[PDB]
Write a protein that binds this ligand. Structure first.
Ligand SMILES: CN1C[C@@H]2C[C@]2(C#Cc2cc3ncnc(Nc4cccc(Cl)c4F)c3cc2NC(=O)CCCN2CCOCC2)C1
Length: 277
């Protein structure tokens, strides 16, 4: 394997809450001293806890792609904090639930392309994400989403997103990420429904072994649903590759109404992190 020459930037604390729960994410502004630049950022905040957040920082510092979120730096002043580009529209899970009456086929298909591009990049880096879900895809603008949350990622638990072979045998590959991608697409196409709603996690592996799968969302043509189902085949190598998913959803995005059926479808020195290199 090649040496990882990524830079880990240590930020001084002198350079509102968005959400708390099972950590805390804040919105903020980063002004690197000297340069006349204000960067909108998000900030995510015991020895075990410090070790797990540092593993997340390692992966997040090591990626660089338009459809993956990158670590800007860490701050070490009392707790370990991770600093990253602020994604002001939040995660796709909340976004599709909130804007469901206003989301057209073009957006849904383009998001599918973008998420597959991010995952294909992670595969190129030999990274298995292990936690792909719509809650872990963030919205920079409605036109541009990026994959985040590398806390379970590893070089080559959320049961209802995992491939059967992962639930049974703790086997994780880029093809088990493809299964999670399928579930993520189903979340978007149902405008944020909960997969297997009602079913306890302990029953998922048996439901899957019997051949049950998530049902066809109402807006999905059979073309789109068949791609989803291909992601949930037992034979991992029979599932699509992320590079094929990019191609297929790109074709569909050129004529989105043929593939999704949706009623009504027809301050001075702020620099975004993507322009601060
Ligand atoms: C609902 N509106 C309220 C608010 C303005 C809005 C927002 C937001 C938001 C911006 C982020 N911008 C950069 N990054 C992030 N996350 C992150 C991940 C990994 C490392 C680091 Cl450093 C991070 F900062 C960000 C995370 C944000 N909220 C979210 O994803 C919510 C998704 C849902 N929940 C996920 C966890 O389970 C419970 C459900 C939308």
């Amino acid at each position: 394997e090649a040496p990882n020459q990524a830079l880990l930037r240590i930020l001084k604390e002198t350079e509102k809450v968005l959400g708390s729960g099972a950590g805390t994410v804040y919105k903020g502004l980063w002004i690197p001293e000297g340069e006349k630049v204000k960067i909108p950022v998000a900030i995510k905040e015991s020895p075990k806890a410090n070790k797990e957040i540092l593993d997340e920082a390692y992966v997040m510092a090591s990626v660089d792609n338009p459809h993956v979120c990158r670590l800007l730096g860490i701050c070490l002043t009392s707790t370990v904090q991770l600093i990253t580009q602020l994604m002001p529209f939040g995660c796709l899970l909340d976004y599709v639930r909130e804007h469901k009456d206003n989301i057209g086929s073009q957006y849904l298909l383009n998001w599918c392309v973008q998420i597959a591009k991010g995952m294909n990049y992670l595969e190129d880096r030999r990274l298995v994400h292990r936690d792909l879900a719509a809650r872990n895809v963030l919205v920079k603008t409605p036109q541009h989403v990026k994959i985040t949350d590398f806390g379970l990622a590893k070089l080559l638990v959320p049961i209802k997103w995992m491939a059967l072979e992962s639930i049974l045998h703790r086997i994780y590959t880029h093809q088990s990420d493809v299964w999670s991608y399928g579930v993520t697409v189903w979340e978007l196409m149902t405008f944020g429904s909960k997969p297997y709603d009602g079913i306890p996690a302990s029953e998922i592996s048996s439901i899957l072994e019997k051949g049950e799968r998530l049902p066809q969302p109402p807006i999905c043509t059979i073309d789109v649903y068949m791609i989803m189902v291909k992601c949930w085949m037992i034979d991992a190598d029979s599932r699509p590759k992320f590079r094929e998913l990019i191609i297929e959803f790109s074709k569909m995005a050129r004529d989105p109404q043929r593939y999704l059926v949706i009623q009504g479808d027809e301050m001075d020195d702020v620099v975004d992190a993507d322009e601060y290199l």
